[PDB]
RNA sequence: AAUUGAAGAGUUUGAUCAUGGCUCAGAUUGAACGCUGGCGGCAGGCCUAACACAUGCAAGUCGAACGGUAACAGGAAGAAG
């Protein structure tokens, strides 16, 4: 259950006396299929170095998520920079419908049957991220009683 | 048992994030044109000039309301082929 996938890879330019010096960037997501997900950025002058350097970053920076079966307890909202995202339990029809990009975090992270949608900018670095934070804030379907109870 | 269902992409920049229009993948059609065209079932077929119209047909029927015989069908005292 290693499970990992990169979401977006990109080129960027730096500009010096002698011209443009380019380089790449990688955005990755890793999860165990049972909660726990992280993302990593990491950039590098060549692609495989960039994705490698990323998968790593993702290994740490990993948070976990109070799932509830294969789905989410309550419908959650997330938002970071321009990306404002929303996903919903969905008493699984089949489920797992989202914009490949946050399907990526969902998938690996173990959620099996949601419906999701991203608003604002589809800028991956911020949507995958608005989502993680999304699932993170999402609170425990009983440690809400822990919360109250008293 | 019986609406239990929601995805994003391209494009301003050297590059970036934001803002923001343009564009694209989808469904839908009483459709047209271009190329092509085998058979069948159901359906659809002037969206325009409420423009103008040759010709046929689209409202009759009842002799058990009525006087009726002009047509054709028979029959009739009786005149005959
Ligand atoms: Mg340019
Ligand atoms: Mg032809």
From Swiss-Prot:
Keyword Flavoprotein: no
Outcome when changing residue 11 to L: In strain: SPCR9; spectinomycin resistant. Not a ram mutation
SUPFAM superfamilies listed in its UniProt record: dsRNA-binding domain-like, Ribosomal protein S5 domain 2-like
Domain S5 DRBM, residue spans: 2-65
This protein's GO CC annotations: cytoplasm; cytosol; cytosolic small ribosomal subunit
Protein name: Small ribosomal subunit protein uS5
Entry similarity comment: Belongs to the universal ribosomal protein uS5 family.
Any GO molecular function: structural constituent of ribosome
InterPro entries: Ribosomal_Su5_D2-typ_SF, Ribosomal_uS5, Ribosomal_uS5_bac-type, Ribosomal_uS5_C, Ribosomal_uS5_N, Ribosomal_uS5_N_CS, Ribsml_uS5_D2-typ_fold_subgr
Effect of residue 12 to E: In strain: SPCR7; spectinomycin resistant. Not a ram mutation
One Pfam family this sequence matches: Ribosomal_S5
Alphabetically ordered keywords of this record: Acetylation, Antibiotic resistance, Ribonucleoprotein, Ribosomal protein, RNA-binding, rRNA-binding
Gene: rpsE
Oligomer and partners: Part of the 30S ribosomal subunit. Contacts proteins uS4 and uS8. With proteins uS4 and uS5 encircles the mRNA as it enters the ribosome, which may play a role in mRNA helicase processivity. Can be cross-linked to mRNA. In collided ribosomes contacts ribosome rescue factor SmrB.
GO BP, sorted A to Z: cytoplasmic translation; maintenance of translational fidelity; response to antibiotic; ribosomal small subunit assembly; translation
Upper lineage: Bacteria, Pseudomonadati, Pseudomonadota, Gammaproteobacteria, Enterobacterales
Further remark: Altered uS5 proteins have been identified in a number of mutants. Some mutations in uS5 have been shown to increase translational error frequencies. Some mutants in this protein can partially suppress an alanyl-tRNA synthetase mutant.
Domain remarks in the Swiss-Prot or TrEMBL record: The N-terminal domain interacts with the head of the 30S subunit; the C-terminal domain interacts with the body and contacts protein uS4. The interaction surface between uS4 and uS5 is involved in control of translational fidelity.
Role, per record: With uS4 and uS12 plays an important role in translational accuracy. Many suppressors of streptomycin-dependent mutants of protein uS12 are found in this protein, some but not all of which decrease translational accuracy (ram, ribosomal ambiguity mutations). Located at the back of the 30S subunit body where it stabilizes the conformation of the head with respect to the body.
């Amino acid at each position: 259950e290693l499970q990992e996938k990169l979401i977006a890879v990109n080129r960027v330019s730096k500009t010096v006396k002698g011209g443009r010096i380019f380089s790449f960037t990688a955005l990755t997501v890793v999860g165990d299929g049972n909660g726990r997900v992280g993302f990593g950025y990491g950039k590098a002058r060549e692609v495989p170095a960039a994705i490698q350097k990323a998968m790593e970053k993702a290994r740490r920076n990993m948070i976990n998520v109070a799932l509830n079966n294969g789905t989410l307890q309550h419908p959650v909202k997330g938002v970071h920079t321009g990306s404002r995202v929303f996903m919903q339990p969905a008493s699984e029809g089949t489920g797992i419908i989202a914009g490949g990009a946050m399907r990526a975090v969902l998938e690996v992270a173990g959620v099996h049957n949601v419906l999701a949608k991203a608003y604002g900018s589809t800028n991956p670095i911020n949507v995958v991220r608005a989502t993680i934070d999304g699932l993170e804030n999402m609170n425990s379907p009983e440690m809400v009683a822990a919360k109250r109870g008293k």
